[PDB]
């Protein structure tokens, strides 16, 4: 019973865990939805660029360095994976 949108594959407890790491004590139920949408929004930008470098290089395979380059564009550099 897994055939659906994979966004719901992000289980509610997984969110509950992340709020803890950010130090959030108490969470209302309505948070679980926009967090999905907000996170959803975040992917849209990064992959679009990530796709762009790959197809510009004519490559059909998304490689690791393509990720950091796009992440660098949004003002969030990523140490640890190349460059």
């Amino acid at each position: 019973k897994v055939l659906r949108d994979n966004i719901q594959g992000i289980t509610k407890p997984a969110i509950r865990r992340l709020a803890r790491r950010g130090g959030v004590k108490r969470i209302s139920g309505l948070i679980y939805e926009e967090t999905r949408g907000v996170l959803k929004v975040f992917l849209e930008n990064v992959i679009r660029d990530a796709v762009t470098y790959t197809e510009h290089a004519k490559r059909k395979t998304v490689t690791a360095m393509d990720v950091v380059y796009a992440l660098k564009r949004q003002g969030r550099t990523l140490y640890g994976f190349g460059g």
Binding site: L18, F42, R48, T61, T63, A64, R76
Partner: protein
């Protein structure tokens, strides 16, 4: 890994994903989410509450400027 493959299919078709490139998205998204979380508390505690509600996460994403 399913989720990234699903969304990426919209932008283009037949994208084999390098395994190393995968875990990056989580870590980048995780910290972004984690950072987006902590400041929400400051918005929440400012109104003297203890529980966060989505109207705050919207307010917080505005002050950074990303909401617009």
């Amino acid at each position: 890994q399913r989720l990234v493959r699903e969304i990426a299919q919209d932008f283009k078709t037949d994208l084999r994903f390098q395994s190393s490139a995968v875990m990056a998205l989580q870590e980048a998204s995780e910290a972004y989410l984690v950072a987006l979380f902590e400041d929400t508390n400051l918005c929440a505690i400012h109104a003297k509450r203890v529980t966060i509600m989505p109207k705050d996460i919207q307010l917080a994403r505005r002050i950074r400027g990303e909401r617009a």
